[model samples]
Target: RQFLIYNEDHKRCVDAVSPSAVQTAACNQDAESQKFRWVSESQIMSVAFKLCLGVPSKTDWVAITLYACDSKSEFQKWECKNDTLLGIKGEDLFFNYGNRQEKNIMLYKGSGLWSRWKIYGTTDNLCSRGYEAMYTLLGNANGATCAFPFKFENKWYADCTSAGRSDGWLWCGTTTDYDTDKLFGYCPLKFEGSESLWNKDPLTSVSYQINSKSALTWHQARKSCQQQNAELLSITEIHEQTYLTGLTSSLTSGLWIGLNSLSFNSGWQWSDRSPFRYLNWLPGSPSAEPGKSCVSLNPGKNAKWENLECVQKLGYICKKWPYAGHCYKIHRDEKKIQRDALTTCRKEGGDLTSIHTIEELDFIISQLGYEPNDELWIGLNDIKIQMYFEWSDGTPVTFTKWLRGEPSHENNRQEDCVVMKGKDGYWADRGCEWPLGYICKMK
Candidate 1:
């Protein structure tokens, strides 16, 4: 469970600061900066910073700081008394609340509201909070804002999980207990291009599907990722390695990463067929055990890669590159020229529709309530350079479904805009002034 230590008298929280500092600041309900947990009776660890609050000097007062968690350190052995004050485990000294707006928290022999503190358990509010309805098929972008930590199989998680899932895509419960009501929503590929639980590492922009519920052999795990249009986890760079290490640090057992050897002594290779250049193996690992060619990341051992038998069962990670996907709307009621259609789209925070693939084009057509031969303007234009078309949305033109003999270049070479023929959803170059309905796309 997660908790926040609040200075009830000051209406502030004991928040973490950079440079290994601790202070009291305005309360934040959702920020990880205020979240903490007791790993043991003597150590309280920050959820976001992954450090323990302690003092550098034993005798010095008002010197609160954070450091790497070490249970053996006496400085970290803190005790809360009467649920209102915190002090050193064995000393009479207690934390102090100085000025109302003071940034740094202090420690001293203190009593009264200045020293009053309380712990707020966020997990306890889960069942009492309201939840937003989420759709399983709509990418659930709005659902990301509604997501909260939930309990499943007696474990709590604030992340999008595929645990106990038959579909194997990532999702999270709409309530505190997913086992009871079973309400859920699919996690978005990328939530408005923001760093979300679906993709915590914004620099990499990759989303992962982790499953610890069913342990499977390496081959079975590989097959599962393939079925989901993803690849088994592969650490191709140092940042990815560090991010994955932190992600699985608290998980139990080893996790199957995409690494294996073809023969007993052959060089190791990634199951995704990526270049196997980086390695963070345990000391004297890649052991020469016959048929022990598969690899797993041992979180208990600093997420170090280790060789294991191919048939050994373990949890696995599946990874996929996420796109800032688009949402489309067809406007059959409004007819406008190419430029006018673009103006309306801009008002909606997007641009005239641009088709990139068969599936997207099909989707647009499916939403069309138009006559068979009706024309709808798209975002393609050769306005800047004759015979050179580009998407108005600035995306690279990777696909085009131009009708044969289209873009005629015959209307006195005046056709600089493009439109989709509703009958077959094929495109044709047209004059920019031609009036037609259009679809709008938003990212």
Candidate 2:
């Protein structure tokens, strides 16, 4: 079977650019240049070029050049016996990634993230195999098969989609191109734990995890959601409220929502600061009585909201927003000051990325192939007012990943810009003039 060798750190695929060249590039499922086959005994042959990876010499700095396959040539031999280290058969030299350069493949006597590679289509494979490829139902039409990595309207899709459909149900074309043939099947709804304890709303794509098994007080439940970097359920639209009510149709008790009044005289507000335009208040509810400010959704009472004491123990729901896919790019090669990077992003119809959740932060980190100590600029700064940081895209700063005792203005050196501090994933403020690589986000 053919495979794609991906660098674990860079998330790029190994490519055979020519008979004499090998490197890494952005992964493309359609590119034959990125495909390889294991000829035998760790000897990987380029599928497009029919050449095996080898070197002219055993030197530490020699390029991992491609050459005609030869069984007797020790230079053509290597050790992929382990997953990460593609070490020379009996030598210490291993395949290493060149530092953020166009020439990606090299031989070095070092071991690090650069040397770690993951060969797909084997263990933890990317493409479906045999029965999975042939029998997997299309999203599940009776006689249709789901095409993995199918083509639809000139774009490639790796997952089932709800696009071009008003029904809001996930589905995929039975064939590769949905535009050419209208054949399609419904994608199965996903559930976690006790029969849909966790589900993603097909309409909104917002995910929720219901902890009906673990009852906690409203305050504690809110803290639990915050610990996971999520928020207590916030219903901003009638559709969301309806979807959630349907999800809890089988429940026997109330569950805590994000609604709460800071004071008995104050109006209800969502804990996550989402707009509070939608309500399912129980009749004669939301009492202004002291100590009864928290709200819970009583499935037994048509999922209507009822005010209760903050200390009342109840099941709760945690909500997480859907991922922002295909709108982010990491400019690892273009080092620039904070303002300059913002300008570059603006020119490209985006802005330096403004992160809002741990999920988004982790997703961005997965794209970074930087060293452990390298910092990258993000779209957060206090340039206009010290200690009043705001996103360049003008979004509210609802989330932060600040390290302890950070945003420091110690020594008064104008630490106003923000960066993701290396492998720790913490946010730290620094001077805006410092040159650094940055991430950009578009609408």
Candidate 3:
């Protein structure tokens, strides 16, 4: 079995190094670094996570970390570190690092990050932390826990634990193509592959509205969202942009963004006048057209921004800053088919309300209160993949709390649509034609 090594403060995880290589540290949850399995050796104290983790590799070196406890049942402290690996038999049922009779189990940390190895003590959060977080953390770095997710390379890195100084300029970037990579970091995007965007959580701070079948030019869409007390989506961070685009990952077309450079030399400006801190242009983007100046996110071009004709009609997203803790808009006035619900949201400037997390689901329930006869629409369904539910909001399905025996694959009917019951907040599959007031989001 594999486990995910997680960091408490950062909420990120140990991942293989940047640009996707073998397990290196200072990475994120998206990295493949978080999956590892312990192959029980003949000796009890020994374990192998390398080839034992299951990915095929010819490298024989195995790294490990050991945690010391006064008793086998309690591991509240560790003397810095000793770690996991295979035995001489390439086979021992056990490989105990601590001496039960007397070696006093000085755990060893064989590898991770750079060649440097150090120790952390009781003050290092051994006693106060939760057990599963450590076990999950231990399982992933594959016993190499030293490669802390600290980095000066990527400012978008969410795990850095300390303040940064003027580390000054240095040969930088992860690309081998020196033509594209850079050699410094005085700027936010100093490296090619190192440049990244992150979305702060949207479920709390963003309020939005999605109306279907509605289409408008760039300026008109901006005015519409404002009428709804929001601004056309202004992306100030990578995650914000990602979340907006994610809401439409399954779409086959493009949409307008709040960025544009109208007059010559004006530069990009968001409708809300937020800082212009990021850009996600596609290859050959900003291509010159006879009269094009506005921007549209063309998913056909990998959801990258494209210089577009301002008059071209497209759906647009609207966002508001800290209006309320609730990030959704409830529309009880009308009902629509599942397809129509998604279209309705897109038409208004957002997508179907995706229950991306439990907090989001609970918030929806709270806002919903009680409607026993009402079957509300949520953005989860198997439209894109049979038997595998996916969020229309583009989030991967990592968590769920389906009612017992619910969400059944009732086999006979094309019950691919999903609806949430109001009373218990459990999910159920409904036929696509069922009419129910659904939720919409704008962020």
Candidate 4:
């Protein structure tokens, strides 16, 4: 019998024909045996065997028989020592023989067939044992297979378990290409294959409204936005401009956007760092009309972009992150005392405010309802000096819109405070003692 052994456990097995030699040989052959002794109940060992028949020598009549030892008490005692093969003997080992010799040889050959080998003993109390054979001989190769598909160099391959595939179909093979368009017809899943679909629209774009209680020119408003770490709403794309136009469509007034031709002739820029890729211009719009370097959204004709003076009153949008806290405005009538008006605004948590931009001015006009006949007292005043305006916080006025022949200091020296006029359409300085209502601002 021929046997094949494998170290199913960490220990190596020993080859020995005698049962007594089993333990001795195993201990001698394995290094682990020096540190660990065999504990049959815990560690198991296995062996596989195959039998082969030897060639016959004579063609004379012979009978062979087989039987196994009938020791049922223990597997270790069970053996093929008593097993016998009953067969006729063959004598002519090489040369062809006569009919009688051939018959005898054939009979002996048939009787010489090998018998199946069986396990005689196990080192441990193992429950099961069997011969380890190849899968091909077991007829199970077909059903145990799996398929993999994926793309490679623009072609698909079938039987490519190594490469990834779509829907089990091999790309280069009989499999179909992955068609995202087909999967989601109208709005296909964004694919990197198309550069245009690489970026997605922001789910929640920022929106804001500011009330420029005290009107300021476009340059002033832009500066205010800069101070607040923001910029005027400068429309760079047609879609955004269209959206802004739609938002301000109901009113005839114009609102400010980030767009401005202020610095360069006909050069426009947006406040939010957006590129000027598209525009929604009204026919003959933004002619950069003389003195109109700043841009605003006009709803005059179906809503379009129009360039106008930055100082023009209209509502405005301020884009910011997180939140701008809270914004509020105070209104005052000239009939009331300016100091009392300032006190009222402060009592309500605001100060006489300065308008930052046209956008903020528009926002204030829209919210408080601007009247052509009413003049609003801004936070601007020259109480410290004549003809020089400053914000309530003492920030010097960098930009100003003075009405024709206004700020005459009217007595050329009596005026000490500044007041904005909605009708006379300019700013004027008056004595601080003068009684006039004032607007208050707070955030």
Q: Which predicted model would earn the best lDDT? A: 2
User: Positional deviation of 368 in candidate 2, in angstroms?
Assistant: 47
* Candidate 3 Cα deviation (angstroms), residue 101: 31
Q: Could you give candidate 4's per-residue lDDT for residues 1-443 as a string of tens digits?
A: 11222222323333323212222123232333212111121111222111111122244333211111111212111112212222212222211112242211121223222211222233321112321111010011211111112124453322222234333321121112322211101111122331231222253364533422223456555554454445667554446556655555566655566766554422454656553324455666656356776666666666666678776755444444011344655465345555666667778777675655555555555565555565656666656543344576554444344443333344335665557666433455556665665656677
Model 1 C-alpha lDDT per residue in residues 1-443, reported as the tens digit of each score: 56787766577887888536787677887978887766555666676675777777556356677776675798877776655667777877766657445567666666567666666643232112222222232232222222345567876654566787665567676565666766666554334422232344688778876555446678877765665567778886677888988888787688888887753322456777664435477765767565777888887789888889988877777787112387777677778888899999999988988777778777776654546777888898878655456789987766656564343444365888888884777777778886688878887
If ranked by lDDT, best first, what sequence of candidates would result? Answer: 2, 1, 3, 4
Residues 230-310 of candidate 3 have per-residue lDDT tens digits of: 676666556666676666567645667777766452345667766443546666656656467677776556677776889
Worst 10 residues of 4 by lDDT: 134-143
- lDDT of all the models against the reference? 0.67, 0.70, 0.47, 0.40
Compute the lDDT for candidate 2: 0.70
What is candidate 2's lDDT per residue for 1-443, written digit by digit as tens?
56788776777888889887798889887899898765545466776776788887788877887886676799978775255677778888888876647385888877787776776534442212211222122222332445544557776554566777665666676665676776666543331222243588877778887766545678777765665457899986667878888988999688889988753322456889764434467776666466887889888899888889988878788887124653887777869999999999999988989888778888776654545676888998877755456788998776666554343444357887888775667677778887788878887
> Candidate 2: lDDT of 287?
61
RMSD of 1: 22.0
Q: Once superposed on the true structure, which residue ranges of model 2 sit more than 4 Å away at CA?
A: 1-197, 263-266, 321-443
Residue 373 of candidate 1: its Cα lDDT?
A: 74
* lDDT score at residue 25, model 2, on the 0-100 scale: 85
